[model samples]
Target: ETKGVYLPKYSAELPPTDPSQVRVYNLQYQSDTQGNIGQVRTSTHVSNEKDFQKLCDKNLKEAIKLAAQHGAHEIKYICLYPEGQINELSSVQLRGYAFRD
Candidate 1:
């Protein structure tokens, strides 16, 4: 569910694109910006995986793809906790702001 909605800020939604078309960033955009669409969260459950970061990389990419589907050009202010527990089980947790750039 969308936890916040400062979206549809300037124009009608853009067409959805493939995940490759979207870019992910941990730092805020460096140029002038005004597209704080909404908060994004993606959680991937983990069990018996010895390689954690690799899995989180994939989950994080999926989160970016989700942002792309909603017309975000990029993601920023990213936070990640791949080892966090949810429902008493390990999971990859991602939180960020989706931006139009």
Candidate 2:
């Protein structure tokens, strides 16, 4: 079973496609608006500092890869935890959404 959440609920059967074809739009810096088809989200734990520092770029890379595998074609939002957001060993989280419309 997929641990990721689906927007339409019925999109679970979406076939995997090329993630590079996905157009990424970040809400944090995006002021424009657009339509949607379906979206997906994935949360991952941070293992070491090597990954934490490069999260800014790493997250987007993985998100698109996720969309590519999930058959999505766009990324709407991408978010991450702060250096001390968890107050623990520094956790990395992704709030990016994959769009198909």
TM-score per candidate: 0.63, 0.60
Error of 1 at 65 (Å): 1.7
- The digit string of per-residue lDDT tens for model 1 on 17-100 reads 666766777655554234566556666666645645765676667677777788777776444554444344666556667676
The residue-by-residue lDDT of candidate 2 on 30-98, one tens digit each, is 443345555556455565656664664566667677777777777786656656544445556566655
Which RMSD values do the candidates have, in order?
5.0, 4.3
Scored by TM-score, the top model is 1
lDDT of 2: 0.61
List the global CA lDDT of all models. Answer: 0.60, 0.61
Worst 10 residues of 2 by lDDT: 1-10
> Which runs in model 2 stand beyond 4 Å of their true positions?
1-8, 28-39, 43-53, 83-88
Q: Distance from true position, residue 39, model 2, in Å?
A: 4.1
Worst 10 residues of 1 by lDDT: 1-10
